Amino acid sequence: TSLAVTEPEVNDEFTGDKEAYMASVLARYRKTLVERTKNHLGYPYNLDFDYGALGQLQHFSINNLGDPFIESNYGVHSRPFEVGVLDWFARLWEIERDDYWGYITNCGTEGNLHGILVGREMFPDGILYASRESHYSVFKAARMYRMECEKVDTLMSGEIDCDDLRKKLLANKDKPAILNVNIGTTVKGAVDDLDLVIKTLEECGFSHDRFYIHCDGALFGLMMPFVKRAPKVTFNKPIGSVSVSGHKFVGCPMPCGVQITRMEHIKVLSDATIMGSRNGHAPLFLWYTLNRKGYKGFQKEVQKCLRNAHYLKDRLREAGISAMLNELSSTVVFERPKDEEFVRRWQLACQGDIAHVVVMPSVTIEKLDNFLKDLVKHRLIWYEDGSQPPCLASEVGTNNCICPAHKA
Amino acid sequence: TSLAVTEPEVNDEFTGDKEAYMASVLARYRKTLVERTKNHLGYPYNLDFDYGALGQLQHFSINNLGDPFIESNYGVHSRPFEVGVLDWFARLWEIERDDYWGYITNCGTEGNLHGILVGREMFPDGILYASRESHYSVFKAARMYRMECEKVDTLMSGEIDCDDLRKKLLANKDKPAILNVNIGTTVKGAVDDLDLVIKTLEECGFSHDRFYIHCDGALFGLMMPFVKRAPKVTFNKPIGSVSVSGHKFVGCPMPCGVQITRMEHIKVLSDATIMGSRNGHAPLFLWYTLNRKGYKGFQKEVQKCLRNAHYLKDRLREAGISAMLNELSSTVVFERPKDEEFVRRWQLACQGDIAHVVVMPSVTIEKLDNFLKDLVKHRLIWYEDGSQPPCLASEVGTNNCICPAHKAA
Ligand SMILES: *Cc1c(COP(=O)(O)O)cnc(C)c1O
Ligand SMILES: *Cc1c(COP(=O)(O)O)cnc(C)c1O
Ligand SMILES: [Zn+2]
Ligand SMILES: [Zn+2]
């Protein structure tokens, strides 16, 4: 479709027919947005937010040019808010105000673009090593920045296989190593074992001064910190940088995120942001929610998302449907709906014969129960022909599959 | 400064002390934004917009993942609006629906990043040639993308010196040419002569298919089209791509822009956007304003911005102050205020001993008059010790300078 942009009539100042046409379009649009929001499950966006308190600020063009810390003569900005937000993220990952540098990004890809660019200026001859299941932005960065990339193999879970990382590293002891570590993969919600990655690096003869790690924690990077007894991402380990998405867990009307690296790394980048003009509203949104919820509030919500993910998985198994849920994940991978109009209604994310539900704060038991009824109901129709579902052990592991051959 | 993020008390659910604290902070903030907006002149942002009509849409997380044209399973998006906006920009630069590809960017730098990346995948061995006064994003892109860059010299106006481009091109006939053409330079509001650039290229033996041009029209790229008798940027010339900023002329609460290239070029890129998640509100804002104003409305406002720029220049000269205003520009370059707290109050953009006022739609004669009074008043104070204002001819040309030595040229 398209909604054309047509010239107003010569009469328009008298008749107001444009504003009237547009009002209906927007009304119609809004209605469809409301229902799409209601019935969304597939993507890692928290749809539950109230920024009514920021209502009176929405009409200014707030723009944080360049560095959050350097001042600029453009006065319509929100740097004090940005800095407060950054400080909070620094404290979260155990780096002191004076050691870190960071900024609020447009999105998850920008974070990956920034961290990887940093890695490259650290080690201009570095190879980029990354899981095959790391996000496409990682590989795009390699192409954009003209870097050799070595795609590491993956376990069933979607984790990086650190044994294949050994092979790769050893074969390239010649040159330094730039790593992309996934804190929650797009597809299976896998968490690369940071510690085993660091371990592998050292015992392949890469000392700290000869590698750089970016942690892409878009989704789960903000959730893991609040999981008790979970390997921490922290600048107390040889971590270069961490990206995380605002529009994912926090819930924002605009996409945004937070890139945090070390001060030392940013001087060796000698304006250190990928983008120039930066949406000064994003800092306000993040400032308001962090202030409102705290470590405490985030803890509650993470625990709930895990509980509800575990609920969804259990309930799928009981219904006969094979499903999987990694540790350190709110994302449930189950067998793809057959009629993929059901996929579009529920805005599910699909690949091969698998689909996933990312359980965010906005995803509620009521809404899961609604999904489950409508799934079971449409399952009967899809498979009334005596036809059976696909076997799923290829995708998810035999220990997780329920097909006739497995019930394992 | 900073506004700390502090944990709520254990009591907070009962007392609501956080929401109360924050309300004052936001109130205080808003008040300062109101006055900063009122008295802003230096930067190329139109501050005059009413998107009250879009008020009821502000609470959804609208996200146009990847390609405007490809569908995605995420249903909270605004692709139909984006496409409508793109079509409008395609028509503006004389390229048909089926020939062009484009998207709505986060900003001007993103457009430069995209167009230059396109140039590179066209000519992996290309040299990037760009004016010295092209925006720093152009040079960042070269570094990011590991490209040889040849900084071309500039005339006094701020235009690319096409004679120095000859020299540079001829010295590198071996390899193809990727050009960045400025439709309105950050500092002097110069317009690179696109035609003379194309001309120079051809008569240095670069046929089409051995060069790529990106037009960075961040500011003026949207204004020039509505200037009568102005060299057109159009896909009817050997143009690769054109970037333009929403938050500049149109006026937006969030930064955004429009990158438009050719379909052919994007297949040779084979997801073709720099960024992944894309703010789906930006398309709505652009859709609403384009629909509301049209070619007609844009014409009015451009003509007004020129008139008012010319007003400001005239008035500066009368007051004794040396100033310059290129044709094809709403940006007035005059002698930098001495006490640069006056600079911060008026949010002026400064470099060496020069400063500029970018006359956008929101910049009004009343507001210019206010600026001029307050300038003249503070000038007397700055210079009542027999100390003199700077000479400016280095920066702007002797034909534009009024200092004692130059009144007589
Ligand atoms: C979707 C995704 C991204 C990309 O982030 P955007 O906000 O879409 O730019 C990065 N990392 C992961 C793990 C993702 O799932
Ligand atoms: C400021 C500017 C840009 C950069 O655009 P952003 O919106 O700040 O990313 C590009 N080109 C010109 C001519 C500029 O003046
Ligand atoms: Zn099986
Ligand atoms: Zn002079």
Author numbering:
A (entry chain A): 67 to 336, 346 to 483
B (entry chain E): 67 to 336, 346 to 484
From the paper:
Through optimization of crystallization conditions, we successfully determined the crystal structures of CsAlaDC, CsAlaDC-EA, and AtSerDC at resolutions of 2.50 Å, 2.60 Å, and 2.85 Å, respectively. The crystal structures of the CsAlaDC-EA complex and AtSerDC were obtained and further analyzed. Additionally, His308, Gly169, Thr170, Lys309, and Ser347*(‘*’ denotes the amino acids on adjacent subunits) establish a hydrogen bonding network with the phosphate group of PLP, consequently fortifying its attachment to the protein. Similarly, in the latter structure, the pyridine ring of PLP was sandwiched between the imidazole ring of His201 and the methyl group of Ala284. The N1 of PLP formed a salt bridge with Asp282, while the O3 formed hydrogen bonds with Thr252. The phosphate group of PLP established hydrogen bonding interactions with Lys314, His313, Gly174, Thr175, and Ser352*. The catalytic loop in AtSerDC, consisting of amino acid residues 328–341, is well-structured and exhibits clear electron density. The superposition of amino acid residues in the substrate binding pocket of CsAlaDC and AtSerDC revealed that all residues are identical, except for the substitution of Tyr at position 111 in AtSerDC with Phe at position 106 in CsAlaDC. The results revealed that AtSerDCY111F acquired alanine decarboxylase activity, whereas CsAlaDCF106Y completely lost its alanine decarboxylase activity. Moreover, compared with AtSerDC, the serine decarboxylase activity of AtSerDCY111F was about 30% of AtSerDC; AtSerDCY111I retained lower than 5% of serine decarboxylase activity of AtSerDC; while other mutations, including AtSerDCY111A, AtSerDCY111L, AtSerDCY111V, and AtSerDCY111W abolished the serine decarboxylase activity. These results suggested the Tyr111 of AtSerDC is also important for the selective binding of serine for AtSerDC.
